[PDB]
Amino acid sequence: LDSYDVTMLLQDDNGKQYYEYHKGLSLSDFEVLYGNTVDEIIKLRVDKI
Amino acid sequence: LDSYDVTMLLQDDNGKQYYEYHKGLSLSDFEVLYGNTVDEIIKLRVDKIS
Amino acid sequence: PLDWTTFRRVFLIDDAWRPLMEPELANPLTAHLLAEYNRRCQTEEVLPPREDVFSWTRYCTPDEVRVVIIGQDPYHHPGQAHGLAFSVRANVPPPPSLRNVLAAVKNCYPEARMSGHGCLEKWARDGVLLLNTTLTVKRGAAASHSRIGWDRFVGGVIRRLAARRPGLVFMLWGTHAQNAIRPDPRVHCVLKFSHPSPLSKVPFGTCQHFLVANRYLETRSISPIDWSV
């Protein structure tokens, strides 16, 4: 099983940016994570660990 | 209305790693590109450009 | 200048598609599109091969088309694309979006015999037109040939196909297909869903277009599509 470090830079409805960090996710985990994200995507970084 | 650049570092069945650069895509286009990807993802970068 | 006889021979186009495609040769954009395609072919690795670019004209005639499934551009790795949207060559394991399309077929029809393969020629011969708006791509770069004129040319073919007679079924998956192709919903059966990509907001396995399209065909006294593949 490949595991990944997933980083997102998101922007809320007020225009405020923030980072969210996720360690050890599989690609399926990333897909559910991406699918459930509601705020605007500024950056996405997915790296095999 | 947002536009994005997509960079991938992939690995083929022979273990050889290579870069792919996808420029000025909509977020929906990135989602289609991901669903067409078959080789192993080593790195993925998605950045809003406009 | 651009002659139909030369154009269909160079691209192996079925002449049954002539009334729908030949008027595009009078659009000055077509000459620029062909010269840009000829130039890219000499400087980069272009997919699918030339004989496959218009394979979508070879499985059925315009009068046999029942369903239009819209795609974007071809798969960008050698051996994948063969001129139809979503479909892959027989020896190729289905990529993620195509696996989701096949799971939705199987959920719609639990008794369908699925091969596990991703070659969709069987659907194409049955009047399922699997049409990308962009017909070529540079190897390793998604949407690289998306701004050379293919969508305008293909856009013209779809408009004339839709104008021939009412009653087509359109399956428009994702934002891009829904924004680009807007048929009149009182003339054609227009079906919309999120994209089969695993990254979509809703799982594609829940899509019932295959059943809805078949119930529509029955009301028009047309036999249903066998979605097994």
Residue numbers in the entry:
A (entry chain D): 7 to 55
B (entry chain C): 7 to 56
C (entry chain A): 16 to 244
Paste lines from the article.
UDG is exquisitely selective for uracil bases located in single- or double-stranded DNA, and it selectively removes uracil by cleaving the N-glycosyl linkage between the base and the deoxyribose, leaving behind an abasic site. As previously reported, UDG forms a single domain structure consisting of an initial left-handed coil of helices followed by a β−α−β structure that forms an internal four-stranded parallel β-sheet with external α-helices.
Protein p56 of bacteriophage PZA, when co-expressed with HHV-1 UDG in E. coli, appeared to form a stable complex. Reminiscent of inhibition by ugi, the UDG active site is occupied by p56. Contacts to the UDG DNA-binding cleft from this p56 helix span Ser32 through Asn42. The apical leucine residue fits into a deep pit between the two helices of the inhibitor dimer. Glu37 and Tyr40 side chains from p56 molecules C and D, form the walls of the box. In the apo form of HHV-1 UDG, Leu214 adopts a conformation similar to that observed in the described complex with p56, with a shift of 0.5 Å in Cα position but with a similar sidechain conformation; this conformation is also similar in apo human UDG.
